[PDB]
Amino acid sequence: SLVPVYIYSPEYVSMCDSLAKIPKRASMVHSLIEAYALHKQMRIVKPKVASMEEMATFHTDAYLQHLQKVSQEGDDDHPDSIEYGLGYDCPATEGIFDYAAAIGGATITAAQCLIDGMCKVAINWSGGWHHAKKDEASGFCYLNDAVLGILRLRRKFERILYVDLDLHHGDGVEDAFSFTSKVMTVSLHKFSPGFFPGTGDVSDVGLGKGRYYSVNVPIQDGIQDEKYYQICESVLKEVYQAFNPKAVVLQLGADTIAGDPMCSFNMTPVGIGKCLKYILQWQLATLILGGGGYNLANTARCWTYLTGVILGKTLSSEIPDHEFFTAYGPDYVLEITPSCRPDRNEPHRIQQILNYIKGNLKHVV
Ligand SMILES: O=C(/C=C/c1ccccc1NC(=O)c1ccccc1Oc1ccccc1)NO
Numbered sequence: 001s002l003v004p005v006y007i008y009s010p011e012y013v014s015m016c017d018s019l020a021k022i023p024k025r026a027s028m029v030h031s032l033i034e035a036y037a038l039h040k041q042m043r044i045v046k047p048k049v050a051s052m053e054e055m056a057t058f059h060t061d062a063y064l065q066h067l068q069k070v071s072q073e074g075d076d077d078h079p080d081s082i083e084y085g086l087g088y089d090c091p092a093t094e095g096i097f098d099y100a101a102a103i104g105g106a107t108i109t110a111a112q113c114l115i116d117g118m119c120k121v122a123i124n125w126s127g128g129w130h131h132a133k134k135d136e137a138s139g140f141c142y143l144n145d146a147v148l149g150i151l152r153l154r155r156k157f158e159r160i161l162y163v164d165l166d167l168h169h170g171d172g173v174e175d176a177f178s179f180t181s182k183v184m185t186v187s188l189h190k191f192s193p194g195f196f197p198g199t200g201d202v203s204d205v206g207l208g209k210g211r212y213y214s215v216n217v218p219i220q221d222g223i224q225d226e227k228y229y230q231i232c233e234s235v236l237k238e239v240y241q242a243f244n245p246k247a248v249v250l251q252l253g254a255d256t257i258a259g260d261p262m263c264s265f266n267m268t269p270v271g272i273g274k275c276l277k278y279i280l281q282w283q284l285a286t287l288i289l290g291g292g293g294y295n296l297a298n299t300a301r302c303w304t305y306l307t308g309v310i311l312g313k314t315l316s317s318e319i320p321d322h323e324f325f326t327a328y329g330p331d332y333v334l335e336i337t338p339s340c341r342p343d344r345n346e347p348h349r350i351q352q353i354l355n356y357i358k359g360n361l362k363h364v365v
């Protein structure tokens with residue numbers, strides 16, 4: 001019950017590997033974790049597959065049923081797919097319903113371990129698909145596992161904090177809870193004309209009873225570890241005091257990391273780790289999720305490193321030999337180097353944003 005749960009099975013990783021666009025990522029991540037022998041210090045738990053009942057706690061039957069049909073066959077003979085957000089951004093490829101259910105189940109299983117007092121921290125690195133809407137796929141997210149996890153947690157925990165460090169605004173999750181104060185969502189993300197999904201300005205604060213229970217930190221290109229942590233920690237301190245959460249769901253998409261095709265933020269896993277540590281020192285039930293991350297090796301480096309932090313271990317700089325060793329060339333080290341690009345974040349603007357937020361959280365009761 002001090003030992004973290006690690007949600008894993010070969011069938012689950014195989015299923016997550018089968019995504020074109022990020023092929024074999026789940027495998028690379030697990031493979032590297034295993035190769036630093038970190039699994040030996042965690043409780044490995046086979047994930048369940050989510051039932052239609054479970055998936056419907058958030059998603060609509062119309063949507064789930066459509067997803068199912070498209071999964072069996074394909075998208076020829078389905079011009080209806082546009083209505084449910086399938087298309088270039090969420091290809092209507094065969095087998096996606098099974099994929100969806102695997103991932104939803106995985107996250108739920110994680111949440112269930114936490115409810116059961118099996119652990120204080122539970123990990124599903126192949127989850128975090130935070131864009132999916134109740135009846136619409138979006139941003140390569142077919143099913144919002146984060147939301148399902150949060151809903152499962154609500155059985156035991158009255159107030160839940162969602163923190164979203166992915167490069168993108170966590171809109172799917174926010175929207176799901178925008179009208180309630182029982183879940184607070186906090187997202188740090190790039191906010192910029194034309195940048196997906198386009199939502200999440202600082203003045204996005206929630207609605208009705210949920211007003212002030214959505215926090216959004218719009219950030220510009222080229223941010224680095226030190227400044228990001230200052231921002232993050234400044235915001236999370238206020239949030240803890242104001243919201244006093246009983247449990248935490250934490251999305252750690254690695255598309256913020258230097259070297260990502262997204263080529264926007266300029267972070268390293270150390271910076272993100274500091275943010276992680278800060279949440280961990282609260283000692284709350286914590287559901288850890290992956291998300292974006294499209295430089296596959298770097299994404300594995302990052303999440304492997306962060307598992308290290310969760311375990312309180314220091315990992316060796318030298319990448320261990322293992323299935324995918326070649327992909328870590330030419331230097332074969334764990335550390336990641338910031339690019340040489342400018343930080344476009346003007347300090348005054350940041351300070352405005354931070355103050356505005358502290359003001360908003362005054363209101364919170
Ligand atoms: O990181 C994300 C979402 C990313 C995303 C959103 C809308 C459309 C495409 C996205 N994905 C990419 O641009 C992306 C970039 C590099 C490699 C693979 C990627 O996945 C794809 C690419 C094309 C279509 C679908 C998914 N959320 O955290």
Ligand SMILES: [K+]
Nearest residue numbers: 164166168188
């Ligand atoms: K985010």
Ligand SMILES: [K+]
Nearest residue numbers: 177180183213
């Ligand atoms: K909310």
Ligand SMILES: [Zn+2]
Nearest residue numbers: 167168255292
């Ligand atoms: Zn992202």
